[PDB]
Amino acid sequence: LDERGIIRIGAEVVAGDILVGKVTPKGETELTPEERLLRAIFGEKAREVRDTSLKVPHGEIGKIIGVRVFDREEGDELPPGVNQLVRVYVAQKRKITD
Amino acid sequence: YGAAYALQELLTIKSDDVTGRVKVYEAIVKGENIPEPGIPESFKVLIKEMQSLCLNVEVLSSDGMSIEMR
Amino acid sequence: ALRGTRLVVTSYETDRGIDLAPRQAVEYACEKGHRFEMPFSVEAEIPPEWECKVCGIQALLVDGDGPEEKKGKPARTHWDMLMERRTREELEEVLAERLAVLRS
Amino acid sequence: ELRDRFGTYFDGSMGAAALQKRLESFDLEEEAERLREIIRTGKGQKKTRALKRLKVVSAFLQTANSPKGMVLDCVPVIPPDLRPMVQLDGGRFATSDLNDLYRRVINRNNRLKRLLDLGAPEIIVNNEKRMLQEAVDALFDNGRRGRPVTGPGNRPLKSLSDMLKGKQGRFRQNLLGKRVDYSARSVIVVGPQLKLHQCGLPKAMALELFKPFVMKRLVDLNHAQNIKSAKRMVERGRTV
Amino acid sequence: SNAKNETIPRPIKASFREGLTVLEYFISTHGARKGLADTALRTADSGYLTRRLVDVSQDVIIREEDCGTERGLKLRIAERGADGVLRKTDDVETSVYARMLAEDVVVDGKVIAPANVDLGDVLIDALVGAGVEEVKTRSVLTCESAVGTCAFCYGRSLATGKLVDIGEAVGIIAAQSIGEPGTQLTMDITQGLPRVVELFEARQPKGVAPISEAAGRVRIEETEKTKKIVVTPDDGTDETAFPISKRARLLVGEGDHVEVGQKLTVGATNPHDVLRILGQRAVQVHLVAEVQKVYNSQGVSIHDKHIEIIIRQMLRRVTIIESGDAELLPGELVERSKFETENRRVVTEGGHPASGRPQLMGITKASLATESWLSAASFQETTRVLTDAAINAKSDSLIGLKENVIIGKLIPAGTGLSRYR
Amino acid sequence: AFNADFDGDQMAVHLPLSAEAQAEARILMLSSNNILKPADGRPVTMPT
Amino acid sequence: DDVNFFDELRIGLATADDIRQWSHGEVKKPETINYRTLKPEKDGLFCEKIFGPTRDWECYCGKYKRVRFKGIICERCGVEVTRAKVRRERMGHIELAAPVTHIWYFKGVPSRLGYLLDLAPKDLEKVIYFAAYMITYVDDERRTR
Amino acid sequence: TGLARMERVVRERMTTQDVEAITPQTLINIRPVVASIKEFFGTSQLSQFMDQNNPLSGLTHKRRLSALGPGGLSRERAGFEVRDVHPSHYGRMCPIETPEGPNIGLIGSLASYGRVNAFGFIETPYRKVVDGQVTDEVDYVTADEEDRFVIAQANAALDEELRFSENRVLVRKRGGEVDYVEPSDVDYMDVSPRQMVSVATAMIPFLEHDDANRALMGANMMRQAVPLIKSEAPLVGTGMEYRCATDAGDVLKAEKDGVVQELSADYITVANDDGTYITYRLHKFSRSNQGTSVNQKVVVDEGDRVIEGQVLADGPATEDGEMALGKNLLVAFMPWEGHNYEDA
Amino acid sequence: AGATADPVKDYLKQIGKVPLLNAEQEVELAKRIEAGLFAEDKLANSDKLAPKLKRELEIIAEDGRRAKNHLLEANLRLVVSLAKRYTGRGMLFLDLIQEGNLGLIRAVEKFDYTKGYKFSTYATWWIRQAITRAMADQARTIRIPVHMVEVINKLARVQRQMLQDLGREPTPEELAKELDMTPEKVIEVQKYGREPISLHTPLGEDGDSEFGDLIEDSEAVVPADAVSFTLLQEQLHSVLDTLSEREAGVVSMRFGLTDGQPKTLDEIGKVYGVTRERIRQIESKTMSKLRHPSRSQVLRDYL
DNA sequence: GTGATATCAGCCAGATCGTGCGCCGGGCCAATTGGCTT
DNA sequence: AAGCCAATTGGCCCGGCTGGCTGATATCAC
Ligand SMILES: [Mg+2]
Ligand SMILES: [Zn+2]
Ligand SMILES: [Zn+2]
């Protein structure tokens, strides 16, 4: 991932990899006793924002060809209520197989 | 073929038995006997719709007593 | 793929637990002889009045007092506006003229 | 004119209330006996009509059902989770087309109550009652009588009946045949080295089909310490 | 053929090796496309037919080892040839093979075929050598079992080569076997799959050929835009008049003598007339032969028992004509079991036994007039079935396969029987 | 038996779980116990 | 619970008593969800007092929020504390101001109402849809006298 | 349809509002027109997401005659008589290329020489023959005029003095029936053979030796081939590869004659003859609708001279200007240990 | 008689039987209404007049009621005209007509003839008000209050006018400046007015599915997660067993493992009969004990 | 633990005037009329 | 001239626009 959290051009991805890093806030929630006890053990304070990053689906591979990013604050004509958009292109060469 | 148990599991604990899917997963993971199937959710949805149509659908036990499906 | 969620939440709490906080049953009755009991937490303020969702009528406690509540604002009718706009003598003379024409 | 001249000696009514009154004061056994006598003595098309009528007259005569059940005073309401209001990503809400019909019923019923307790000419009350009955009819069966109601895009709404009938109803699509777990699909090639009782699965499909079993097995052999590490190990696709 | 179905009197005198000219290729595209479209539609037609067949006979399962019945069907083997020497009948593999003998066969005081045997080619060859032409075999049509059918009447299970077990679902097997070759049957009178659909639905054929009712003399009447055949029986009863159209091709001349069920015109007999005039056995034979003709035309082999299951399912009810005092309204179809038991109860402490007539009905009507409202609702016409059951307050006992499948419990067949569990 | 060609056809795989389902799939539905055809009794699992 | 005990499936003609015995409460308003907080509106089609809580072991106002408070009707809002899955099992009902016919027993040929009352379908349709009157009673003896 | 609502609104507001303060700008509301245009171009059964497997697929998606859609008919209501190959389709609609699913007969392809009339009918060209002499006058004829005349066959042996030889020529008559006739009644002749076959069906060598079903399958299956990284034109093809590839619009063609000035895998700048310079850009590893790759090669060199219409860059599945959907492989016909058993 | 499948036509043909009215007729009808109402009130008063006076009083009351009914039946046509003016956008024609009828009833209730003005305009005001209120309160599945509906309508009108005059889609800043509100408010108002889609909308050409058949249930119990949580609970109970009885007990009663009820330090000390700070000391010791590089690895994975 | 003030939501009213929504096949039932029957 | 026994045809259904006034809520503060 590069400075703004978008995969680098030329990187090779495999199933489960992260293409774009995204964080979504979730607000106040109550954890189960076991989870709270485990957090107390390891002392990992909750961040209150979960991850919704974009990952390659199962059974997909290939290099990264292009990354196109649109910002609603850069004059792009994004639809209402869409701050930012990003598109990532993955290409792979297939040989003939049974 | 005459295979009743395979059909019953293909219809209950693989599609609709909401409380049975987790139980069967736990049974497989812990290495023990698969539990008996329950009653599928689609039947309950059908009964609810039929009752919503002002039809008095009810299931009876050996004696003429309703079960009420929870 | 399409992702959508109903505005619902789920919890891992076992619900088998080890003990439940004590509750008290308060009894109510209907005007047609239908009766029921409602469970409330002991640390609670009992409401003197309830709605029997079994029969859809107002219900009071077995031994509670019977309160009286008046209308916050009575539903305005035609007659109220007629006093508001027309004077008493105007209505009196209108009625007199109407009675005269009816008699004639 | 007849009412103001001969108001007494008879009671008249209009709408479903008249049918309810007639069904309440109905002598079923007398009608059944009359139909039986006509069948025995009379002949012709009258005999066939009486035979057809006795089938529906006799049912209520003996069984626990009563005719008054054909007219409704209160209408049941299906649980909300069977008519969900789901929130799609982006704020768009998706409904189930039964909320609209229920809302029509409730709105028209409330307006009817307002008109009745307010005092209105018979024309308005009768029109409101007709609209309420049509709303209930559309709720139960849509398009059976008159023209079906439509939403955006001018396509008929789905009613309670439509969910049980047809090739896409509850009975045929969700009950007699369903989707199942632990299932895979793929294109077949030919292997002539196999025996008559053998098949060849690709290892991706086999691994995804047998995931719990392999997790338990590799936990057993100490290839992992717990089911969490076993699941991560299977997902990452190691060698062992 | 042309775009319309009619031969073009100019052939394609060139094979695919020598190459076709432009016009010949264009002419061939006609038949090519027509065949492709017929192939496209046959799939849906056969699927619908098989669904109906499965629905009518889902609950026909084996539930006994032997009913002890002494009855059966007289099946013919070893049709006599033109040389005076018995020759085995052509269709013995699908008529008498995999079937049992109702009664022992004795010729010249020798038992050459004991009762209740598989009746393979060895026994048939021995019987033909001994010089017999008829055998009284056991069929489901004549099973006296109280519950369902029994293994000995069904006979051998063709899928395994041994006696059918006591939990087999023979009805579904019969439905599937009859319905599978539907796509192979390439679609005045119906010829292909529509002919089978017509036969199993007990419909009136297209080219209806009236069949005489009483033996006697026949006379023909001539009039414009009409023809009539009047039959005077030898018994002297009233005349019988059959009207027909001008185009109809006659088969019996004026003053000729006719049999009880002899045809009086070229066409297709309708099952109802043959039933009413010659009993249940005649209609059974007619239906089996007519159904097997369509399949044999395309070289499809299906055993007779599979069709016999459907046929017996189609003849399960009797229509009441005489009121009697059995509480059965006239004109109300009733299962023969209910009618028989009601008559038995009435004859005791009663005077009038109700009388009825056999009724032949199609697979759709038979499968919709069932005793379980759940299966009927799940078949088709859901709204009508439900609004009828609600008024009748019908109670479903869950004794079939579809009901148990719907509610999610062990089907009462195969390994789900309490005998094995 | 499957009426399956090798010009792009696809097939589905299901996994029995319980002991009863496995016993049925192993004793009743096995591939090498189904030589004959239920319709008429002629073999279908035959060199073609 | 156990399908092995299902003995029969009986269908009947539901009456008002059955309809309002199934219901856990009467829905008397047409609102579904608040446009801002997205929470069910009271007495609406999605109310929680009638159809159950929307969150496991939690009431509408939030006074009770734990599994310990199980099976307690929060006096503040009336919602009980239990699993949200009960929203798939609880029915409500609407009390009509005037009676209504069931379309199934009116239109489905043969019209069962017509056969039972011996009324032609056109006459019955006229009566129910407020197009003509209907004499439901008459004093034969008194009028003759 | 949009303008109908627009003018209804215009007249209503003109009547309702005042006068002497009204101008055309404040009477015309163009919302309905744009709304109708948007509705048509989106969620309409005739505005289809394009097919971009290869140049042939794109070219065949155009030239497609669909008999179903808004105002047409339905898939399940069409009978067995509207899907037939009526004898009036000769030269106007292909009888081979149609879908094999439940759409058989309801979608077709325009023939190679077909043309659309002013009223929407389809015309086809015929060479006029007078007094048994095949002239060089081409007349475009519709179905009715074709029924009026008697049409000869494309491959009719001639004496080479523009005159028929055998005196017994197979010709089509009023009802589409074929018959032998003398060389005096004939009045029209086909312009060429393969006048009745579509563009995709004209690229199957030895088509006259193939059953109609197999030719139909081959035509429907040539539209699914994917473009490979290295293209190679067929060794034994038809004469219709270059024309199809160039007319499909996926081959870069010079606009004006000139000499290539500078060249690179991304661009070609040519100095036209009239003094102006023009630079052409090439797609490299783009993406088509179907997920394949669009990539254009260069077939010219720096010193070459190019005339207008010359091909300067290949396409996704072309090789030097002509369609190339596959590769030439050395094939042997024999069974081999059962690995090629039953169509493998 | 002759009920049709189009109730609108039947209602329209039924409301035309009664004729219209004139200004003098309306004035005298209002006079009759007022006289009847006043006479009915006077009768309702306790004092009792002569029987004949009460009889004529009832007669005039009946006449006034009939006059009111006639007036409403006459103005039904005006109600229908306003309704058809407001037709569309959410409500059916008959619903609008009924709301207009209620508004007309209110207008007749709140009407005075002293002004001498034609009764039509007052009823028009009231009918329009009632129809607008009802439409704002019943035209959406997710109800929006009247003021927010007004804001949404004004924003839509301004946006349409800007699009027409300018010829280009207005950017949010332009609308914010013209409407005199922040861009965030404009965005929120835009997001409020959207109408929901249906789960039964077909999406495939064949029609084998609906739009609601691919909506993933994002609030169900994933069996893998449930079994993982159960294994975590078992492992936690096993690990807490290795500790001493006192330490495990204090941890359990501090995090409420057994009952789910967290407890304060003082209560724990009370049950243990020790100081609050001492109890706090024990919790820290156990917390560090579990977070050690000798017992952590049995619990690291589950975190 | 309160406490002031802004929005948040629901309800009510105005007067000139204004008066009519915007494909096929198969099975069955019911209305009509020819032709008897009295 | 009234009533009934049939045929005939038509139809239906089912299978593939400001404004004012008041109490409750919240949101920042003490
Ligand atoms: Mg294949
Ligand atoms: Zn038997
Ligand atoms: Zn609460």
Automatic annotation (TrEMBL), chain A:
What species was this sequence derived from?
A: Streptomyces venezuelae (strain ATCC 10712 / CBS 650.69 / DSM 40230 / JCM 4526 / NBRC 13096 / PD 04745)
Q: What does this protein do?
A: DNA-dependent RNA polymerase catalyzes the transcription of DNA into RNA using the four ribonucleoside triphosphates as substrates.
Q: Would you indicate the residue range of the signal peptide? A: none
User: What's the domain of life for this entry?
Assistant: Bacteria
The Swiss-Prot or TrEMBL record describes its family as follows:
Belongs to the RNA polymerase beta chain family.
Name it: DNA-directed RNA polymerase subunit beta
Where do the coiled-coil regions begin and end?
Answer: none
Oligomeric state and interaction partners are given as: The RNAP catalytic core consists of 2 alpha, 1 beta, 1 beta' and 1 omega subunit. When a sigma factor is associated with the core the holoenzyme is formed, which can initiate transcription.
TrEMBL record, chain C:
Which family does the entry's similarity section mention? Answer: Belongs to the RNA polymerase-binding protein RbpA family.
* Keyword line: Metal-binding, Transcription, Transcription regulation, Zinc
This chain's protein is named RNA polymerase-binding protein RbpA
Query: What does the entry list as the binding residues for Zn(2+)?
Result: C30, H34, C52, C55
Protein role:
Binds to RNA polymerase (RNAP), stimulating transcription from principal, but not alternative sigma factor promoters.
- What GO terms describe the biological role, i.e. biological process, of this protein? positive regulation of DNA-templated transcription
Q: Which cofactor does it need?
A: Zn(2+)
Any note on cofactor binding? Bind 1 Zn(2+) per subunit.
UniProt keyword annotation of Translocase present: no
To which species is this protein native?
Answer: Streptomyces venezuelae (strain ATCC 10712 / CBS 650.69 / DSM 40230 / JCM 4526 / NBRC 13096 / PD 04745)
The keyword Transcription belongs to this UniProt entry's keyword annotation: yes
* From-to range in the entire protein, with total length: 5 to 108 of 124
Molecular function, one GO term: bacterial-type RNA polymerase core enzyme binding
Q: What is said about its interaction partners and assembly?
A: Forms a complex with the RNAP catalytic core and with free principal sigma factors.
From TrEMBL, chain I:
In this chain, the stretch annotated as Sigma-70 factor domain-3 covers 150-226
Q: Which GO terms describe its molecular function?
A: DNA binding; sigma factor activity
Can the keyword Transcription regulation be found in this entry's annotation? yes
Keyword Transcription regulation in the entry? The reply is yes
DNA-binding region extent: 265-284
Tell me the segments the record calls region Sigma-70 factor domain-4.
239-292
Q: What is its main location?
A: cytoplasm
Q: How does it assemble?
A: Interacts transiently with the RNA polymerase catalytic core.
Give the protein's biological function. Answer: Sigma factors are initiation factors that promote the attachment of RNA polymerase to specific initiation sites and are then released. This sigma factor is the primary sigma factor during exponential growth.
Name the UniProt record assigns to this protein: RNA polymerase sigma factor SigA
Q: What is the covered span of the full protein?
A: 264 to 566 of 567
